[PDB]
RNA sequence: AUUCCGGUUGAUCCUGCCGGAGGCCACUGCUAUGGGGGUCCGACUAAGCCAUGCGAGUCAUGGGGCGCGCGCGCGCACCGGCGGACGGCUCAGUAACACGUCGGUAACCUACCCUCGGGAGGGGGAUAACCCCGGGAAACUGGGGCUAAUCCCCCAUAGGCCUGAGGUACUGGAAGGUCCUCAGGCCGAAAGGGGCAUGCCCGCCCGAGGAUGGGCCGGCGGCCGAUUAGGUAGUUGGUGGGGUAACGGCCCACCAAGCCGAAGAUCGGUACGGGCCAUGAGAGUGGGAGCCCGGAGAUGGACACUGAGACACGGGUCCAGGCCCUACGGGGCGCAGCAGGCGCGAAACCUCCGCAAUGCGGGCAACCGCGACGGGGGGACCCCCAGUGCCGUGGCAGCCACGGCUUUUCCGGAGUGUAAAAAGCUCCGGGAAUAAGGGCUGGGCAAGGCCGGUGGCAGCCGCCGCGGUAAUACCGGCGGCCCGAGUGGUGGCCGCUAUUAUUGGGCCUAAAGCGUCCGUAGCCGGGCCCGUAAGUCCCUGGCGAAAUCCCACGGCUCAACCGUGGGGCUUGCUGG
RNA sequence: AGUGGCGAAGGCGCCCGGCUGGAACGGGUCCGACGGUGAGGGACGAAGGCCAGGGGAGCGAACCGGAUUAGAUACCCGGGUAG
RNA sequence: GAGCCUGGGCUCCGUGAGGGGGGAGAAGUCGUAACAAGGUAGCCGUAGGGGAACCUACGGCUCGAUC
RNA sequence: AGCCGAGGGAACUCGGCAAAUUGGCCCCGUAACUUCGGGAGAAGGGGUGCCUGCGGGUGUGUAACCCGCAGGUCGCAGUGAC
RNA sequence: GCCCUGCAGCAGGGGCCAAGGGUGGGGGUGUUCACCCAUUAAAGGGGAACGUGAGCUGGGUUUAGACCGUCGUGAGACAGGU
């Protein structure tokens, strides 16, 4: 026999040089300030996994089937991609932009803690951003629904003072 | 695979092309069998000499075989005395 | 090639009846031969260290064991390899703690806390019978232990009955037979840890074991084997489950 | 050495290639040809697999003859009519199933002396 | 993503093959900042050869004795006891009851362990250490004297085994079994020792059973070859015996003529078997070094001793073939153990620290030992998360000038961490500074109709095809596109391929109907009625180790990873 | 004499007589699924060729001659062996 | 029951005077057999003959043109 | 006209002339090639005495002729010479 | 045993005296000679009725038998072979 080897968590396209895919991925990379295509591809893989689980469970009879259905719906509600009164057909209308909106970089931008996505990435990586209580340095953390309101500046950080030059330059936008 | 050079030669290109392709006969060290290998690059034959050890790859072709307009040759030179031909031909390294 | 018996055991190869981490290390304590089987027992050091948490290493456990601070069936046990099994009693008199060993509906062994009164009784299942010299009857029980009885009272002991005994001194009290209204506790199989009353027995030809049907107090019926049906009471239990 | 472990041919008639050595468990021993004695009796002792004991008779003088529950210890004269090999009657070699003469009469051996150390026989009617 | 694109013609539609474009494994060129986790690293050729050091010991509470200090305490060796048959390495051989699964032993063995029931009576002996004298180059080894034991021997009693005649108490589905009585016989136990103390701890022998571990048997299941067609002669069975722990042609004596085979025997080739893995929408194709379970081997081959267990990797004997020491008389060795070396090759690491954790052996215990195990060192082994700056103003088309900010990373330090360290984590000081390349640029296929050189030479090229004086296709320069701490080259497998087609291909003309008929096995088979219930269907009991796979929750910053639980996998077997 | 007919196919044309195989039509006749295809095996199978024996008109491979041709081991002409 | 020797069977490899045909390769010699009725319509089978493509005879096919 | 000859073994000679080797019976096993009848006793190998016994075939047969096996023992040698 | 040298030594070349001793074994061929091998101090050439058949052998050659090739109408021949 042959033993186990750890496998990738992202997929690559079938052809590397198709104009439409290139254009779309270019636009997304630019507008969400990503470093590579690996990140885009692994978010897309998350989506595809959700979508395959739904396709499988749909019309499957038993008990484990309904258990897994409810598990999936609750997981999505917790991540923040679906409301509570949702159904198994609302999954197939999801897109990748939602998975892209559920990451720290984007949330830190949409919340007014940073002027740009690159600035938000720098903050996260240098350790100025806090979650409920913690310091996380991974701009692809996939923030949950109960934490989106506990995101602030860290106690030990110059930005945590209201009179910091750069924090004033940031508040000058709003 | 690895072998030792015995003879430097030139082969005719097939029709409707006109050119000489530079090659060498190589006597392998595993089994002693003699084969022929093409020297790629502009001037790669001058960075070679008899009794030099050289490493041999496949040339790249249909069914692990002859490629393009030089049939009869299945192999290709990669390294000369433990240095690479690409570097020797670009001018970045030297043959000891 | 192997020239003899085994003396080690790896953690990925340990039985499923154990609560153990299999990837943390490579080696596990191989039990020594003893009363119960390997698929039905767990050593003592795992109890002292991983279940109750009175020690973090094995030196400490050996040290408490070599001082008589732990009993099993009213007896002192100093061997960290001794196998503990079902219906057995673990007693710490320095902490006033008494536990009874039983399985789950999953098949794993646990510790059910009991009282000092019920800690002095242990049920046994008669597994076979023999006639030995002096014309005496020897009952072979389910933990591999044995009891002697006279010929005059041979018809009262059969091969599936249950016997309650004071544990250290090993004196009998309150035999319990195998009938069509007796209480039961399943010990192995798919329906392990269930409980109910007997309804029907069934026999088969040429080597295949006998089957028994049982009814739980919710009213549902289920079958299993007759050697897996431990008898613990007539209408209600005598021990705590 | 007496292997006594396995056959090197299949019933179809094909050949077999031993994939391993000859183990020690599989081995056997050479036979005791229990003879009628002249002066004494001879017994060997043998250690065995699990640390156990076997007793071999080599020479015999006395037999235990039974007639309906009553046993007598008598002597062994010429051996007669061993139905297992022609030469055994001549060599006066005793086996199970052999017919022997005693001071009383003819008797059949019901024991295995190479395994037990005694010759027990039943008298003929 | 259940996918297509280029190539036979002056142009067209087909068949059919070659190539591209995706993924995984091994070698390799250029280039390279930092962490974490993990079942990664002399497997492919040579199961080829090995210099040095380590890889298996422990008990002083079994016994006598020597030395050092105050009968006591410390230490050394000797006799004695248990262990060394596990663990660790490798894939040569093996097409086999070797492996997997279901069953069986009413045909068998088992030291360490548990329960119960019973015993420890009476005598004897030697011999190591110690002292005298030694021999031999060594390796090894002789004589004499003195002594002890949980050392050895002997009597007895228990008990063990065989047979014959009876009784029927037990188990079981079923007694060549167990129990009772009688009779005739062979073998034949034990250490009341040691310690504390004024009874407790550790122990010795017998029996009945279990557990642990093994031996043997059976049904089912899983490669290729007919340019391999007949093979077998203890071969197939029976009667009687020997031998084994035990059944058995396992072996022997005698009587017979059977056993396997076209549904492919025998022979030959390759190959450790599975859980698993890679790929694919799936059916399916291919592989089975690393972790687990099983098997086999220790330079080739054969044979034995001791022991519960071996025909014994670090114990023995011989032959063959290799090497070493020698005072030439004689002696010794085989890394497929950890490191290290030579050789072979395209192809694989430090002659490091520790028994603190997990475990094994020994020991009443305290505890000692372990290249197993754990911990670091080297390596583009696999996976996860990041970096090589950000902001604002202005000028251009991502860059530059200017003005400020931050410190992941870098430099230095204090704690914690750790067996000790290191790394990692918390804090402090300095400072944008300490850190992008590789392939491509005619079409397929994303991206230059720009400039200089070469001039059918030199060279490119998976395929089509460029190059013969204005080369978008060579070489270079400047620009541009793909991926990105990685990117390219060679070889192998799956897919592409409905080019192996059960799902799901084709045979007038492109590859392809036997020249035509009759028929054996085999496959396919008309309509109604009654029965059985073998296939098939449903419900349920007992099995198909764990890891691996899917899901949710929780613990390491999230993750990779680990844990709890719920499902599948285990291509299935079996009782109703 | 047919674009025709019989035959499993190969193949079968003067007339009369004898022996023999198979198919179609018609049929309130008989049996009662006895059937299809057929690995391996078998039977038939143009011309030419071989063996053994007979026969031998015409035609005619090989062969020999005359022409034609740059040549002509051929096409055309005259003879001829096997068949 | 090793090793040694001897004979036999199966099987793999290396080599050898001389000869045989196959496949590629700028440009050579002799002919002109196939495509048009290709200048004697072509091709299957059997046999004989010839420097070579090829030619003839017997039986067949049309994948043969003109009337 | 005959018998033996150490160590070597055709170096003798036109030439292995002359001499020597093998040799009966039972069992095992036997090639190329072939006109499928042969080759073929191919080749190559093992065994073989005396004594004490046990069995089988035909037969009425402790008349007669034949066929298999065990054990014991002696010798340099068992178709012991021919 | 000596003399000359285009004789350093080891050797070679050329010549004088000397006939006491030695000058062998094998391969193909009927051979003599000639050729070849391995050794050796070297492996000389000739005469004696081409020494030696009232000493041997008997391969070759020159009878009587037969085969092939050439020559000849033929009978037959060949200083041609077997």
Could you characterize the architecture of this molecule?
The PDB classes it as ribosome. Chain A has 7 helices and 3 strands. A 3-stranded antiparallel beta sheet of chain A has the order 2-1-3, with no helix packed on it. Chain A has helices at 19-32, 38-57, 64-79, 96-101, 104-110, 117-126, 165-171; strands spanning 129-131, 134-135, 152-153. Chain B is built from 1 helix and 6 strands, in the order E-E-E-E-E-E-H. Chain B has one helix spanning 85-90, and strands at 2-12, 20-28, 34-38, 53-58, 75-80, 83-84. Chain B has a 5-stranded mixed beta barrel with strand order 1-2-3-5-4. In chain B, strand 1 (2-12) and strand 2 form a beta hairpin. Chain B is globular. By secondary structure, chain C is mostly beta strands. Classes of the chains: A mainly alpha (174), B mainly beta (96), C mainly beta (241), D mainly beta (125). The chains hardly touch. Chain C binds 5 RNA strands through strand 9, strand 10, strand 11 and strand 17.
Largest sheet of chain B: 5 strands, mixed, barrel
Instruction: Give the strand content of chain D.
Output: 25-35%
Strand order of the largest sheet of chain B: 1-2-3-5-4
What's the alpha carbon Rg of chain B, rounded to whole Å?
A: 13 Å
Structural class of chain B: mainly beta
Please provide the ordered H/E string of secondary-structure elements of chain D: EEEEEEHEEHE
Cα Rg of chain D: 19 Å
Please work out how many helical segments of chain B DSSP would assign.
1
Structure characteristics:
part of a larger assembly, 4 chains, A: 174 residues, mainly alpha, 3-stranded antiparallel sheet, C: 241 residues, mainly beta, 5-stranded antiparallel sheet, 2 helices, 7% helix, 34% strand, globular, RNA-binding, ribosome, T. kodakarensis, ac4C, cryo-EM
Write the topology of this structure.
This is part of a larger assembly, with chains A (174 residues), B (96 residues), C (241 residues) and D (125 residues).
Chain B: E1 2-12, E2 20-28, E3 34-38, E4 53-58, E5 75-80, E6 83-84, H1 85-90
Parallel strand pairs in B: 3-5
Antiparallel strand pairs in B: 1-2, 1-4, 2-3, 4-5, 5-6
Chain C: E1 41-43, H1 44-51, H2 58-65, E2 71-72, E3 75-76, E4 83-85, E5 89-92, E6 97-103, E7 109-113, E8 121-125, E9 128-132, E10 136-140, E11 146-149, E12 162-166, E13 171-176, E14 183-186, E15 195-202, E16 211-215, E17 221-225, E18 229-233
Chain D: E1 35-36, E2 42-47, E3 53-60, E4 62-67, E5 70-75, E6 79-80, H1 86-91, E7 99-101, E8 106-109, H2 113-116, E9 120-123
Parallel strand pairs in D: 1-3, 4-9
Antiparallel strand pairs in D: 2-3, 4-5, 6-7, 7-8, 8-9
Chain C binds five RNA strands through strand 9, strand 10, strand 11 and strand 17.
Organism (chain D): Thermococcus kodakarensis (strain ATCC BAA-918 / JCM 12380 / KOD1)
Subunit structure (chain D): Part of the 30S ribosomal subunit.
Keywords (chain D): Ribonucleoprotein, Ribosomal protein
């Amino acid at each position: 026999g042959d033993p186990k080897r750890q496998r990738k968590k992202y997929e690559t396209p079938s052809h590397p040089w198709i104009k439409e895919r290139l254009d779309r991925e270019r636009v997304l990379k630019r507008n969400y300030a990503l470093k590579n295509k690996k990140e885009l591809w692994r978010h897309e893989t998350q989506l595809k996994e959700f979508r395959r689980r739904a396709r499988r469970l749909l019309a499957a009879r038993g008990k484990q089937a309904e258990i897994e259905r409810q598990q999936l719906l609750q997981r999505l509600y917790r991540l923040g991609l679906l409301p509570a009164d949702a159904v198994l057909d609302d999954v197939l209308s999801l897109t990748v932009e939602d998975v892209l909106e559920r990451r720290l970089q984007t949330i830190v931008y949409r919340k007014g803690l940073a002027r740009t996505m690159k600035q938000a990435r720098q903050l996260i990586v240098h350790g100025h951003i806090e979650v409920n209580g913690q310091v996380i340095r991974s701009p692809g953390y996939l923030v949950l629904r109960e934490e989106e309101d506990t995101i602030t500046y860290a106690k030990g950080s110059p930005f945590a003072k209201e009179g910091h030059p750069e924090r004033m330059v940031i508040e000058q936008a709003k | 695979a690895r072998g030792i050079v015995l003879e430097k030669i030139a082969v005719e290109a097939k029709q409707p092309n006109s050119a000489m392709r530079k090659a060498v006969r190589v006597q392998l060290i595993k089994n002693g069998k003699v084969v022929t290998a093409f020297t790629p690059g502009d001037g790669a034959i001058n960075h070679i000499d008899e009794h030099d050890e050289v490493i041999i790859e496949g040339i790249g072709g249909p069914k692990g075989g002859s490629m393009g307009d030089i049939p009869g040759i299945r192999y290709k030179v990669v390294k000369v005395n433990r240095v690479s031909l690409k570097e020797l031909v670009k001018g970045r390294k030297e043959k000891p | 090639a192997r020239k003899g018996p085994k003396r080690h055991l790896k953690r990925l190869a340990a039985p499923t009846s154990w609560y153990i981490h299999r990837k943390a290390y490579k080696w596990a304590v191989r039990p020594s031969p003893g009363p119960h089987s390997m698929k039905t027992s767990i050593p003592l050091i795992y109890i002292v260290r991983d279940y109750l948490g009175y020690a973090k290493t094995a030196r400490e456990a050996r040290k408490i064991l070599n001082e008589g601070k732990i009993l099993v069936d009213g007896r002192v046990r100093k061997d960290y390899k001794f196998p503990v099994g079902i219906m057995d009693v673990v007693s710490i008199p320095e902490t006033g703690e008494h536990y009874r060993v039983l399985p789950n509906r999953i098949g794993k062994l646990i510790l059910h806390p009991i009282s000092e009164e019920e800690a002095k009784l242990k049920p046994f299942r008669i597994n076979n019978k023999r006639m030995v010299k002096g014309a005496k009857v020897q009952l072979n029980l389910h933990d591999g232990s044995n009891h002697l009885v006279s010929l005059a009272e041979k018809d009262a002991y059969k091969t599936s009955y249950t016997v309650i005994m004071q544990v250290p001194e090993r004196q009998i009290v309150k035999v319990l037979p195998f009938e069509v209204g007796a209480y039961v506790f399943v010990t192995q199989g798919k329906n392990v840890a269930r409980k109910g009353k007997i309804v029907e027995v069934r026999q088969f030809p040429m080597g295949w074991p006998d089957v028994v049907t049982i009814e739980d107090e919710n009213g549902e019926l289920f079958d299993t084997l007759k050697e897996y049906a431990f008898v613990i009471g007539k209408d209600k239990p005598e021990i705590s489950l | 050495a007496i292997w006594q472990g396995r056959s090197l041919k299949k019933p179809s008639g094909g050949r077999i290639i031993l994939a391993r050595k000859k183990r020690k468990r599989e081995l056997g021993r050479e036979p005791a040809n229990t003879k009628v004695g002249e002066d004494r009796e001879k017994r060997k002792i043998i250690r065995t697999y699990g640390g156990n004991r076997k007793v071999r008779l080599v020479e015999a003088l006395y037999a235990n003859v039974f007639e309906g529950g009553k046993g007598k210890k008598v002597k062994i004269l010429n051996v007669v009519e061993n139905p297992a090999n022609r030469q055994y009657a001549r060599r006066n070699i005793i086996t199970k199933g052999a017919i022997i003469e005693t001071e009383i009469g003819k008797a059949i051996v019901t024991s295995r002396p190479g395994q037990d150390g005694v010759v027990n026989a039943v008298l003929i009617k």
